[PDB]
């Protein structure tokens, strides 16, 4: 199946002299497995998934040492950015970073990622080729020159093609029981009247894993994309996911509307209708 | 070549003393890496500084400390010295490209006491007449004897300029008392010139031995002179007959 | 983590050899080769980054695989004599620290074109009873042995280059405080060429 590994960093400045907060979270697909928070007397990376607890003290220390250094360097990066946008020490600012690798059905490197944001918007990103950068403005062009001089792109390409896919392969093996499993959704349709002789059809999808799903409403065999209420995929808490799709439907003395569910856990796509 | 400057190049001290090594990174480099090379052992990472702050720690000992100054220079402090602290201490600075550029090093020699420190006696031995007749080349030999420890740099000075051509010094000093632990050393060097060059009495040949000894940071209570850092020499003028 | 092989190389001039460097890292950032002459600090030669990458400068060529690096030296000259250090940077480590191997100590035995082995007596310049014996101009295959007598000092062979006249020359020195010392028997413990010249 299609699998990915991602690290999400946040570097928040404290208003207006305080030590900035560095947080790192590690994901395997949508499953969180590591967390490091700089705000603690003795910060250590913590396991967040059961299948990562088998890893040795050398592994936990390698993570902690990287994240304790990022804490120091991201503090300096927050100072550099403040200077490019002529911002004062008063005011909270944030660097957001996400990087990692994707693998297709075949466990080989598909695509590598390395994106950064300053205060919620795109700042600098590594291109698909993994050898060039996309800078948002003249301030992200200063970062680009520094990174080109430091060969950041080469080293990330070595990491994404190497270490990243190897460790993702390892995590996928040790967590196969929960990570390589596929859980099909439990589907059912609900009907509610919105106003006088006007109804709303809501098709539910529950207990599915992974979160990749598609719910569509077809009127007499045609996709009704804009008229639909496609709610965001939400976690159940039990590591599975849930979603629903709604449509404003007139009574019209007949039923021409059907919902279509497509999920990796289904051997054949489902077609459901309101059964009163 | 390379750009990193380390000082002192040589240090001699006793056990229980404290020394301080200095390092200036290459112009433009903001990091300082400290390395130790003990005898037979390879280069071991001690500590890293980046733009004034500690960044990474190796297997640096608790009685060792270091610091990087706001002007980017660095200082390695080695306390409660032991015989086993005798090593080469190197520092490196990294370029933005990722390469480490090393200094020339600081040779620390730790002794149980400094009473066995002796400067070298230097002698120049003139070419044999047999060799001039047989090869039309003339070899001058220099001997630096009775020195301790082996912190010496030998050089040949021909007509006031340092020469490297036709010269060879022993790569290792010879022990004068091989069974004795704090044995004094002997070092030799050869300078070979053409017969005619030696035959000109206008030609001056100097053999320079620079000794690194005591540097006023240590005390002396003996009848002979304090065996301080000094240069000892021996010279010979060219001879027609 | 980093191991170099062999710890010592004993090469004849013009005799090519390849120095090995085995390494283990979480992931390779860069592999480095340094040259270290006695006294001086490590001097940068090359940096390799990916498997199959080759770099070449004059007589040296470095190559990289997933497990090792080779430093091939083609037709070495005596001035290639030094310690060759191999170092790696790891992607699972912050900063640019190098973890070094113990090194390969290379010595290139020079080729002697026209050997004229002889033993000469040198007298002290500053008028003294002190004298030195000099064993010189012997071929690349003769070795100078130490004496078991504590009152006799014998240095190892040493090559000098008269780079003007394209001339290489081996030499060893012997001396003794003993008055009875003589050049004819100074290099006695050693196997000396039968054609050695003993002037009188």
């Amino acid at each position: 199946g299609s699998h990915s590994m991602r690290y999400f960093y946040t570097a928040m400045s404290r208003p207006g002299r305080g030590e900035p907060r560095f947080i790192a979270v590690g994901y395997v697909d949508d499953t969180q497995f590591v967390r490091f928070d700089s705000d603690a007397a003795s910060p250590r990376t913590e396991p967040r998934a059961p299948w990562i607890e088998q890893e040795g003290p050398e592994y936990w220390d390698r993570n902690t040492q990287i994240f304790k250094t990022n804490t120091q360097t991201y503090r300096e990066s927050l100072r550099n950015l403040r200077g490019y946008y002529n911002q004062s020490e008063a005011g909270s600012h944030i660097i957001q970073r996400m990087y990692g690798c994707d693998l297709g059905p075949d466990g080989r490197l598909l695509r590598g990622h390395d994106q950064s944001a300053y205060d919620g918007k795109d700042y600098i990103a590594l291109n698909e080729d993994l050898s060039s950068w996309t800078a948002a403005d003249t301030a992200a062009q200063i970062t680009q020159r520094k990174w080109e001089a430091a060969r950041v792109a080469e080293q990330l390409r070595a990491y994404l093609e190497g270490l990243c896919v190897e460790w993702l392969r390892r995590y996928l093996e040790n967590g196969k029981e929960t990570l390589q499993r596929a859980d099909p959704p439990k589907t059912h349709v609900t009907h509610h009247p919105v106003s006088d002789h006007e109804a709303t059809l809501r098709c539910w999808a529950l207990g599915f894993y992974p979160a990749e799903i598609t719910l569509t409403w077809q009127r007499d065999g045609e996709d009704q994309t804009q008229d639909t209420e496609l709610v965001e995929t939400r976690p159940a808490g039990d590591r599975t996911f849930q979603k629903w799709a709604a449509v404003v439907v007139p009574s019209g003395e007949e039923q021409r509307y059907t919902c279509h569910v497509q999920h990796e856990g289904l051997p054949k796509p489902l077609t459901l209708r309101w059964e009163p | 070549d390379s750009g990193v400057t380390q000082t002192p190049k040589h240090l001699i001290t006793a056990t229980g003393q404290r020394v301080t090594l200095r390092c200036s990174p290459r112009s433009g480099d903001l990091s300082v890496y400290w390395y130790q090379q003990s005898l037979d052992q390879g280069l071991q990472f001690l500590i890293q500084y980046y733009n004034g702050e500690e960044r990474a720690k190796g297997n640096i000992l608790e009685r060792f400390s270091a610091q990087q100054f706001p002007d980017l220079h660095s200082e390695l402090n080695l306390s409660s010295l032991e015989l086993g602290d005798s090593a080469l201490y190197f520092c490196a600075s990294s370029a933005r490209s990722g390469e480490l550029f090393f200094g020339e090093g600081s040779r620390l020699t730790v002794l149980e006491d400094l009473k066995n420190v002796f400067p070298p006696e230097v002698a120049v031995f003139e070419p044999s007449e047999a060799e001039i007749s047989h090869t039309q080349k003339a070899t001058l030999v220099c001997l630096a004897t009775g020195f301790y420890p082996d912190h010496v740099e030998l050089s040949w000075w021909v007509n006031g300029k340092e020469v490297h051509s036709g010269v060879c010094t022993d790569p290792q000093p010879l022990k004068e008392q091989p069974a004795l632990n704090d044995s004094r050393y002997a070092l030799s060097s050869r300078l070979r010139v053409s017969a005619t060059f030696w035959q000109n009495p206008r030609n001056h040949f100097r053999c320079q031995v620079q000794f690194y000894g005591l540097s006023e940071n240590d005390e002396w209570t003996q009848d002979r002179a304090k065996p301080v850092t000094q240069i000892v020499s021996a010279e010979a003028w060219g001879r027609a007959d | 983590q980093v191991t170099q092989s062999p710890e010592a190389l004993r090469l004849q001039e013009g005799e090519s050899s390849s120095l090995n460097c085995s390494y283990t890292v979480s992931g390779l950032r860069g592999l480095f080769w340094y040259r270290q002459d006695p006294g001086k600090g490590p001097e940068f030669l090359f940096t390799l980054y990916s498997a199959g990458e080759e770099k070449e400068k004059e007589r040296l060529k470095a190559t990289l695989t997933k497990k090792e690096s080779f430093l091939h030296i083609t037709a070495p000259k005596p001035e290639d004599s030094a310690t060759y250090l191999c170092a790696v940077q790891d992607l699972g480590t912050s900063g640019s620290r190098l973890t070094f191997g113990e090194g390969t100590q290379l010595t290139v035995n020079p080729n002697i074109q026209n050997p004229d082995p002889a033993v000469y007596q040198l007298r002290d310049s500053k008028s003294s009873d002190k004298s030195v014996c000099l064993f010189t101009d012997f071929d690349s295959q003769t070795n100078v042995s130490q004496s078991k007598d504590s009152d006799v000092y014998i240095t190892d062979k040493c090559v000098l280059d008269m780079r003007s006249m394209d001339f290489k020359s081996n030499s060893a020195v012997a001396w003794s405080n003993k008055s009875d010392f003589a050049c004819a028997n100074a290099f006695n413990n050693s196997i000396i060429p039968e054609d050695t010249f003993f002037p009188s």
Binding site: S77, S116, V152 | L30 | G92, G95
Partner: peptide, 11 residues
Amino acid sequence: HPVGQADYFEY
């Protein structure tokens, strides 16, 4: 496993 940032990797 995260990536280690070498020197001068700041923004």
